[PDB]
Design an enzyme around this catalytic site. Structure first.
Site, PDB file in Angstrom:
ATOM      1  N   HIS A  76      52.818  88.537  40.802  1.00  0.00           N
ATOM      2  CA  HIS A  76      52.785  88.257  39.649  1.00  0.00           C
ATOM      3  C   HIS A  76      50.988  87.904  39.342  1.00  0.00           C
ATOM      4  CE1 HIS A  76      57.203  87.957  39.180  1.00  0.00           C
ATOM      5  NE2 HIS A  76      56.889  88.231  37.959  1.00  0.00           N
ATOM      6  N   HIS A  80      49.694  93.342  38.126  1.00  0.00           N
ATOM      7  CA  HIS A  80      50.696  93.418  37.469  1.00  0.00           C
ATOM      8  C   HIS A  80      50.541  93.552  35.714  1.00  0.00           C
ATOM      9  CE1 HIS A  80      54.921  92.859  36.021  1.00  0.00           C
ATOM     10  NE2 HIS A  80      54.517  91.676  35.475  1.00  0.00           N
ATOM     11  N   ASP A 117      52.047  87.167  31.658  1.00  0.00           N
ATOM     12  CA  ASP A 117      52.350  86.329  33.049  1.00  0.00           C
ATOM     13  C   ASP A 117      51.240  85.598  33.453  1.00  0.00           C
ATOM     14  OD1 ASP A 117      55.160  86.794  33.626  1.00  0.00           O
ATOM     15  OD2 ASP A 117      54.649  88.730  34.716  1.00  0.00           O
ATOM     16  N   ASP A 234      57.716  95.483  31.720  1.00  0.00           N
ATOM     17  CA  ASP A 234      57.757  94.733  32.641  1.00  0.00           C
ATOM     18  C   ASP A 234      58.645  95.065  33.792  1.00  0.00           C
ATOM     19  OD1 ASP A 234      57.091  92.411  33.629  1.00  0.00           O
ATOM     20  OD2 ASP A 234      58.517  91.355  32.536  1.00  0.00           O
ATOM     21  N   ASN A 237      58.470  99.267  37.293  1.00  0.00           N
ATOM     22  CA  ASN A 237      58.051  99.806  38.654  1.00  0.00           C
ATOM     23  C   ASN A 237      58.964 100.700  39.039  1.00  0.00           C
ATOM     24  OD1 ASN A 237      57.111  96.350  39.558  1.00  0.00           O
ATOM     25  ND2 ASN A 237      55.995  97.745  38.272  1.00  0.00           N
ATOM     26  N   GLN A 285      67.126  96.476  46.072  1.00  0.00           N
ATOM     27  CA  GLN A 285      66.390  97.301  45.021  1.00  0.00           C
ATOM     28  C   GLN A 285      67.405  98.160  44.240  1.00  0.00           C
ATOM     29  OE1 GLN A 285      63.400  97.577  43.695  1.00  0.00           O
ATOM     30  NE2 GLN A 285      62.754  95.661  44.706  1.00  0.00           N
ATOM     31  N   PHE A 288      69.411  95.856  41.629  1.00  0.00           N
ATOM     32  CA  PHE A 288      68.577  95.734  40.625  1.00  0.00           C
ATOM     33  C   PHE A 288      68.468  96.949  39.759  1.00  0.00           C
ATOM     34  CE2 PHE A 288      64.555  94.385  38.584  1.00  0.00           C
ATOM     35  CZ  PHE A 288      64.892  93.159  37.919  1.00  0.00           C
TER      36      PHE A 288
HETATM   37  C1  LIG Z   1      69.570  87.368  42.358  1.00  0.00           C
HETATM   38  O1  LIG Z   1      69.298  88.242  41.395  1.00  0.00           O
HETATM   39  C2  LIG Z   1      68.396  89.050  41.552  1.00  0.00           C
HETATM   40  C3  LIG Z   1      68.739  90.149  42.439  1.00  0.00           C
HETATM   41  O2  LIG Z   1      69.926  90.175  43.107  1.00  0.00           O
HETATM   42  C4  LIG Z   1      67.868  91.219  42.753  1.00  0.00           C
HETATM   43  C5  LIG Z   1      66.591  91.134  41.844  1.00  0.00           C
HETATM   44  O3  LIG Z   1      65.775  92.253  42.473  1.00  0.00           O
HETATM   45  C6  LIG Z   1      64.385  92.238  41.791  1.00  0.00           C
HETATM   46  C7  LIG Z   1      63.708  93.202  42.432  1.00  0.00           C
HETATM   47  C8  LIG Z   1      62.423  93.610  41.833  1.00  0.00           C
HETATM   48  C9  LIG Z   1      62.017  92.340  40.785  1.00  0.00           C
HETATM   49  C10 LIG Z   1      62.696  91.685  40.204  1.00  0.00           C
HETATM   50  O4  LIG Z   1      62.140  90.671  39.271  1.00  0.00           O
HETATM   51  C11 LIG Z   1      64.244  91.322  40.862  1.00  0.00           C
HETATM   52  C12 LIG Z   1      64.765  90.486  40.365  1.00  0.00           C
HETATM   53  O5  LIG Z   1      64.506  89.551  39.534  1.00  0.00           O
HETATM   54  C13 LIG Z   1      66.300  90.260  41.015  1.00  0.00           C
HETATM   55  C14 LIG Z   1      67.393  89.363  40.586  1.00  0.00           C
HETATM   56  C15 LIG Z   1      67.126  88.050  39.880  1.00  0.00           C
HETATM   57  C16 LIG Z   1      67.749  88.680  38.266  1.00  0.00           C
HETATM   58  C17 LIG Z   1      68.017  87.982  37.468  1.00  0.00           C
HETATM   59  C18 LIG Z   1      67.800  86.634  37.264  1.00  0.00           C
HETATM   60  C19 LIG Z   1      68.871  88.521  36.243  1.00  0.00           C
HETATM   61  C20 LIG Z   1      60.624  93.117  40.004  1.00  0.00           C
HETATM   62  C21 LIG Z   1      60.077  94.085  40.426  1.00  0.00           C
HETATM   63  C22 LIG Z   1      60.598  95.201  41.473  1.00  0.00           C
HETATM   64  C23 LIG Z   1      59.675  95.515  42.523  1.00  0.00           C
HETATM   65  C24 LIG Z   1      61.186  96.065  40.702  1.00  0.00           C
HETATM   66  O6  LIG Z   1      61.720  94.440  42.356  1.00  0.00           O
HETATM   67 MG   LIG Z   2      57.211  87.069  33.647  1.00  0.00          MG
HETATM   68 ZN   LIG Z   3      55.965  90.585  34.360  1.00  0.00          ZN
END
Ligand SMILES: COc1c(O)cc2oc3cc4c(c(O)c3c(=O)c2c1CC=C(C)C)C=CC(C)(C)O4
Ligand SMILES: [Mg+2]
Ligand SMILES: [Zn+2]
Length: 327
Positions: A76, A80, A117, A234, A237, A285, A288
């Site tokens: 962050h 970003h 951010d 946001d 990615n 990944q 998500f």
């Molecule tokens: C605990 O909740 C999760 C979760 O299980 C996985 C998450 O994975 C993320 C992966 C991310 C990013 C993320 O912000 C997350 C998560 O936030 C994430 C979360 C948290 C989700 C919520 C609170 C709805 C940002 C950028 C890239 C590189 C795409 O990778």
């Molecule tokens: Mg933010």
């Molecule tokens: Zn952001």
């Protein structure tokens, strides 16, 4: 221009393109990706002339804003923010939205992306609540980070020769201010489900014009499009070229891990994704994408169909690729 400035200038030629080499631009610009991408974009959209922004005020504000992202936060940071700015800039130019938004609305979305951010400490809203932080106490546990990003981003406009809005009318500033707040508050993931629900409803009842462009009568619909637009940027990615995506994953994991270390040293239960001793980067990944990123981008794709079909296909390929590494 030095040789380094010629290369930077060459790279800045991709500013209208998804998958700009934002990390290279960070290097070539002397860790000023946000300043030079924002400056490039305001010039490209002729925003300095439209809103009578002195070029020196713009640069002064941008440097100050960039200065207030933490250089020691892995994800962050100013990179970003430059990336969200640039992705928002591309989404704004989509054919299905041509002539839809005013210059004030376009400026609000780009400005909101830049500050969205700022001064992020590298730890989650929940961490800040659980640790009884000053931020959480200030903001009563509700969109703690996102309120702060807004307060900082607006407060920096008051610094010496930093008010890039000095020539907006009082009406223009008032409307811009509300739109920016609406947009940045929408980046709080705890708003995601209800934001996506509204976007689906909008897709199902979508109305177009005689040209085929989206039709938005009212503030409620226009701001909801802008909110989701910046929200998509946001979370863009996983939709980017794989070599960009993987670097964003390395950086978010490192930042999550350092939060888990702080939770370790404090005897707290380590939050999901933050345990570097029991992590599953690839599986996380894929999850998500499946539960968050793809539902959002599929719906945005529907809104602007078929403008975003290649972004959505890259997302799907990147998901398949991460999936393929798990077994
Ligand atoms: C605990 O909740 C999760 C979760 O299980 C996985 C998450 O994975 C993320 C992966 C991310 C990013 C993320 O912000 C997350 C998560 O936030 C994430 C979360 C948290 C989700 C919520 C609170 C709805 C940002 C950028 C890239 C590189 C795409 O990778
Ligand atoms: Mg933010
Ligand atoms: Zn952001």
């Amino acid at each position: 221009k030095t040789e380094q400035e010629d290369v930077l200038a060459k790279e800045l030629e991709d500013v209208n393109k998804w998958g700009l080499h934002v990390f290279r631009i960070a290097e070539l610009s002397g860790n000023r990706p946000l300043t030079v991408i924002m400056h490039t974009i305001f010039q490209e959209r002729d925003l300095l002339k439209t809103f009578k922004i002195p070029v020196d005020t713009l640069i002064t504000y941008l440097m100050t804003l960039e200065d207030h992202y933490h250089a020691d936060v892995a994800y962050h940071n100013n990179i970003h923010a430059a990336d969200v700015v640039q992705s928002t800039h591309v989404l704004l130019s989509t054919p299905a939205l041509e002539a839809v938004f005013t210059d004030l609305e376009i400026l609000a979305a780009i400005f909101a992306s830049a500050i969205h951010d700022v001064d992020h400490p590298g730890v989650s809203n929940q961490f800040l609540i659980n640790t009884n932080s000053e931020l959480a106490l200030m903001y009563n546990d509700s969109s703690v980070l996102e309120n702060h990003h807004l307060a900082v981003g607006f407060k920096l406009l008051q610094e010496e020769n930093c008010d890039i809005f000095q020539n907006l009318t009082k009406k223009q500033r008032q409307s811009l201010r509300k739109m920016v707040i609406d947009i940045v508050l929408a980046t709080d993931m705890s708003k995601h489900m209800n934001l996506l629900a509204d976007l689906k409803t909008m897709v199902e009842t979508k109305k177009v014009t005689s040209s085929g462009v989206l039709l938005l009568d009212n503030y409620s619909d226009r701001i909801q499009v802008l909110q989701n637009m910046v929200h998509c940027a946001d979370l863009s990615n996983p939709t980017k070229p794989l070599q960009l995506y993987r670097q964003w994953t390395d950086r978010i994991m490192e930042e999550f891990f350092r939060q888990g270390d702080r939770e370790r040293e404090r005897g707290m239960e380590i939050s999901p994704m933050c345990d570097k001793h029991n992590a599953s980067v690839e599986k996380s990944q894929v999850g998500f994408i499946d539960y968050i990123v793809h539902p959002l981008w599929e719906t945005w794709a529907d809104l602007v169909h078929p403008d975003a079909q290649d972004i959505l296909d890259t997302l799907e390929d990147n998901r398949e690729w991460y999936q393929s590494t798990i077994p």
